């Protein structure tokens, strides 16, 4: 339960928040994490949960810590410490300067140039899944769209057969929202056990897929190793398999209960990109951290070398000191402030792919199924972790209110 309070941690800064099962979860994950920003909670607190660690609660500190890699290393970015110690994905577990060379190579397989070329492909799949669900008048959004849409896109880019999805998704889920069946260490080992032969055969007979590019790539002039390639593909796998999936559910859950907001984008489709950004702020869902490289006094608090600090990317945009009425969705919001795709040298490499997947979804879905709602009685459940998600999302609609395009 509660790890004994270290001697250096002030008793009054203790706030036992449990990132894997927050107290106010029933009200929605974002709302549950938002408790850390209530009137009497400090900018920086210590929780004795999950082994004990700090938690920056305001955007100001969060952005600062992410900028200062020398004090806040990505060496151990996962909580609990055991997971963080086993975590060695590239470039995520590295700090500049060494991080850069790998980021450049990763950026080459999921970067903008690659995204633009994938546009038509993305639209075709979006249109396909929706046009098929349309006459049915109902769907289980998580498995009928949220998962297949972005996952099939990722497997395509990676050159991996879709039959492996159930196994891979389960492993990634265990790394973000473990059900207890296995440690982060175990899930990582299994992911690597899966990648090894594939990488080997790709360096051997090089193709045009993401895996082949990484496996046969160069890092600042020199050949990447088999192990480095494995570590990088793990970073790409974790990213394009769990995050967009869940975010689409948070956004659709909201749209399903917001006819006014839907009407907005229906009438003025050009507001979709901006709406996408506001949704990214309001339904931010990622929260990982850093490890102190040395004793350091941060905002009046004595942090110790080895201490772990959670810097919830989610909280920045929900901070009222960054956005007035943060919990309100406003597609017209003048200054959408957030760190949803991270902050600093680790800014999400898949953000461009993610935005495209989000916008295309909204545009292609509202254009075919403009009127829809959440199936009655359904108590929509959220789940918290490194990456928060939506358990299930039953939607319903009158086929007569739809249109084929
Ligand atoms: C809504 C969608 C997404 C969100 C909110 C998101 C969020 C994030 C966050 C917050 C980080 C920073 C972790 C840190 O600083 O420790 C990150 C890193 C990363 N993400 Fe994304 N992610 C998304 C989608 C994707 C996709 C689709 C991919 C493609 C595989 C991806 C690939 C990566 C990679 C490779 C990194 C590591 C970059 C580095 O460490 O330099 N992400 N992402
Ligand atoms: Cl999408 C995504 C990809 C990677 Cl590689 C990491 Cl480390 C995190 Cl934390 C998130 Cl959220
Ligand atoms: K580590």
The tally of domains found in the chain comes to 1
Q: Atom 5, ligand 2: which residue's CA is nearest?
A: 235
Helix intervals (H) in 181-328: 184-204, 210-215, 226-256, 259-267, 272-282, 313-318
Q: How does strand 288-292 pair with strand 308-311?
A: antiparallel
CA atoms within 13 A on the CB side of 338: 22
Q: Tell which one of 219, 350, 357, 359 to mutate to probe ligand 1, the residue whose CB is within 8 A of the most ligand atoms.
A: 350
The count of other CB atoms within 10 Å of the CB of residue 54 is: 25
d(CA 184, CA 84): 9
Report resolution in angstroms. Answer: 2.1
Compute the distance between CA of residue 317 and CA of residue 340 in angstroms, rounded to an integer. 8
Q: Which of 29, 92, 247 to mutate to test the pocket of ligand 2 (most atoms within 8 A of CB)?
A: 92
CB of 76 sitting under 6 A from ligand 1? no
Name the residue among 235, 240, 225, 207 with its Cα closest to residue 106. Answer: 235
Task: Assess whether 177 carries a catalytic annotation.
Answer: yes
Positions of E strands within 10-166: 44-47, 53-56, 72-73, 138-140
Distances 248 to 42, 106, 388 between C-alpha atoms, Å: 32, 24, 12
Catalytic, 310? Answer: no
- Here the tokens at position 90 are 């590239």
Give the domain extent around 229.
1-405
The binding site for heme comprises: 348
Q: Is the CB of 94 under 6 A from ligand 2?
A: no
Determine whether the shortest distance from the Cβ of 110 to ligand 1 is under 6 A.
yes
291: β partners: 73, 308
Ligand 2 pocket, 239 CB below 6 A?
yes
For 30, phi then psi, to 5°, come to: -55, -45
**Starting at the edge strand that comes first in sequence, how are the strands of the sheet with 44-47 ordered?**
44-47, 53-56, 308-311, 288-292, 72-73
CB atoms under 10 Å from CB of 111, counted, come to: 15
311 in ligand 2 pocket by Cβ < 6 Å? no
Q: What is the CATH number of the domain that holds 93?
A: 1.10.630.10
Between the alpha carbon of residue 326 and those of residues 127, 276, 281, 302, 359, the distances in Å are: 32, 15, 9, 30, 22
Note the ligand closest to the C-alpha atom of 244. Answer: 1
Q: Which ligand is nearest to the CA of 340?
A: 1
**How many whole angstroms separate alpha carbon 301 and alpha carbon 278?**
33
**What is the C-alpha separation between 302 and 9, in angstroms, rounded?**
8
Per-chain residues with Cβ under 5 A from ion ligand 3: 87
253 in Cβ contact with 30 (< 8 Å): no
Q: Which of 350, 353, 362, 402 is catalytic?
A: 350
Residue 210, ligand 1, Cβ within 6 A = no
Catalytic residue from among 177, 231, 281, 290: 177
The residue from 118, 349, 353, 366 that is catalytic is: 349
Give 123's contacts (C-beta < 8 A, 6+ positions apart): 360, 364
Three-class secondary structure assignment of 337-393? CCCCCCCCCCCCCCHHHHHHHHHHHHHHHHCCCCCCEECCCCCCCEECCCECEECCC
């Amino acid at each position: 339960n509660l790890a004994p309070l270290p001697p250096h941690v002030p008793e009054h800064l203790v706030f036992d928040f449990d990132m894997y099962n927050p107290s106010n979860l029933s009200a929605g994950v974002q709302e549950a994490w938002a408790v850390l920003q209530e009137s009497n909670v400090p900018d920086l607190v210590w929780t004795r949960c999950n082994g004990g660690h700090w938690i920056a609660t305001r955007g100001q500190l969060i952005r600062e810590a992410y900028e200062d890699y020398r004090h806040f290393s990505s060496e151990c970015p996962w909580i609990p410490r055991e997971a963080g110690e086993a975590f060695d994905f590239i470039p995520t577990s590295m700090d500049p300067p060494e991080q850069r060379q790998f980021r450049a190579l990763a950026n080459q397989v999921v970067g903008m140039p690659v995204v633009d070329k994938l546009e038509n492909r993305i639209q075709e799949l979006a249109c396909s899944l929706i046009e098929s669900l349309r006459p049915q008048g109902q769907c289980n959004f998580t498995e009928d769209y949220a998962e297949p849409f972005p996952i099939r896109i990722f497997m395509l880019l990676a050159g991996l057969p879709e039959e492996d999805i159930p196994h891979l998704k389960y492993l990634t889920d265990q790394m973000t929202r473990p059900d207890g069946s296995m440690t982060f260490a175990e899930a990582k080992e299994a992911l690597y056990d899966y990648l090894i032969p594939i990488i080997e055969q790709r360096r051997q007979k090089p193709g045009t897929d993401a895996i082949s590019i990484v496996a046969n790539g160069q890092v600042n002039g020199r050949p990447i190793t088999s192990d480095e390639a494995k570590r990088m593909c793990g970073a790409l796998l974790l990213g394009g398999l769990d995050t967009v999936v869940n975010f689409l559910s948070f956004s659709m859950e909201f749209l399903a209960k917001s006819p006014e907001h839907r009407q907005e984008l229906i009438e003025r489709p050009e507001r979709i990109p901006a709406a996408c950004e506001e949704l990214l702020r309001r339904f931010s869902l990622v929260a990982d951290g850093r490890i102190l490289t040395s004793d350091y006094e941060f905002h009046g608090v004595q942090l110790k070398k080895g201490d772990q600090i959670l810097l919830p990317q989610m909280l920045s945009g929900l901070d009222e000191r960054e956005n007035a009425a943060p919990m309100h969705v406003d597609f017209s919001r003048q200054k959408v402030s957030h760190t949803t795709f991270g902050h600093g040298s680790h800014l999400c490499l898949g953000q461009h792919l993610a935005r495209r997947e989000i916008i295309v979804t909204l545009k292609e879905w509202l254009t075919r199924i403009p009127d829809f709602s959440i199936a009655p009685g359904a108590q929509i459940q959220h789940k918290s972790g490194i990456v928060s998600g939506v358990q299930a999302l039953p939607l319903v609609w009158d086929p007569a209110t739809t249109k084929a395009v």
